[PDB]
Amino acid sequence: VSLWERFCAWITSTENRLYIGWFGCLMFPTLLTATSCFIIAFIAAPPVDIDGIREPVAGSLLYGNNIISGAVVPSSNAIGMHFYPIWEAASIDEWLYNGGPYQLIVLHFLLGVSAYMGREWELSYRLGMRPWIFVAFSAPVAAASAVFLVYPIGQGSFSDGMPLGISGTFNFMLVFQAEHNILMHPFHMAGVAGVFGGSLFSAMHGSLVTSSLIRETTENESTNYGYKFGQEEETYNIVAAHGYFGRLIFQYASFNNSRALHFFLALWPVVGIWITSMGISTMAFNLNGFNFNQSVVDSQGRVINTWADILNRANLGIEVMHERNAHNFPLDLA
Amino acid sequence: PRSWLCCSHFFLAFFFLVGHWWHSGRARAAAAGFEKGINRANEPVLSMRPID
Amino acid sequence: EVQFGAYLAVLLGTFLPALFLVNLFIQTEARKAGKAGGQDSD
């Protein structure tokens, strides 16, 4: 009867086209502002002093870029970790010079993605679902907050944060290799196993369902039209695909349970990306990966090279060349 | 010893945020009755509007 | 300096295959409206 109850009834209605919910009250204003500023800053945005040395790095399309090289540049080294909104900038020209829109996009992104995650919970509550799709979405939220939030914190500047682009991503990955040795760190190892394993069990499960489909169509029409939507009959012989994989490797390595099978598809990647995103986090605070340089010696004591020493000389090439003007002192403490 | 404390209590403090997500998803749904799954006799989606 | 044959590569790489996929959808809906026999078959 009241105005608030007629507003709570609408905002929590599943009869809307897109469910809004109470998290959409701060998902939609956040992500539309992260979007509408991203499209403008990617297309039309002046160059940005990223190194704090007043050498402005172009990153937008109107200043001679493309899809690959164009990128929303991170904020300055001069700012660093300080909060830099528009009203604390004394003009928009001073805001866009010092890496303004990187903080406006990222902070409205991480609020909107952490609200998109809670929105996946909310609709599962109002639909009668068991709730935990949003726990599986915690794994890219852990990884998005690792390279945009946690790594600028432990390194003390948003300038070490990830550039919102495509070539800026590979500037981020290579400089992160030289300074932290991520490939030898066992948490990037535990998530390469998460996505190689994840793409394995995806294409391994998706093939054994498509292999054991039941005849419901003719050879002229499509294979997919043998599934009517909302039917109650099972659309594939699960005993058939169990007997196949029960002979392809051996018998006891096969899940006859389809529920425990469809749980292992959700376990393996998500645990692999939780562990990986806490690799960037523990390497944000300079707890680097393994270092086996000069580890094998002869009885005389001369250093015998290994593959890690060849990997070290690739890291030394990126270390002596990243931010080639920003350094003045012999050790990259930042 | 700073890098051991900032990388281990930080390490745990994300997984306990995941513990807030698991244990409250179950507890809110155990209070409502559907933590064991959807009822076959009464599905809530079928008693809704057309989908659009 | 960009290659001026790339405009012809991209804008025909968009339009010619994308206008192809539209045609397979329009004749799909015409056959469904063709059999249905009401107000649109003719």
Binding site: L61, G64, N65, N66, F229 | - | V10, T14
Partner: peptide
């Protein structure tokens, strides 16, 4: 002149995302 093509590809991609969400073929039981 060159960046005009890149912008048209990007907003043209966001058009077909708009039509796929709102003008989707709504699936129906029976």
């Amino acid at each position: 002149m060159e960046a005009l093509v890149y912008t048209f590809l990007l907003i043209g991609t966001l058009m077909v995302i708009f039509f796929a969400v709102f003008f989707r073929e709504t699936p129906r039981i029976l």
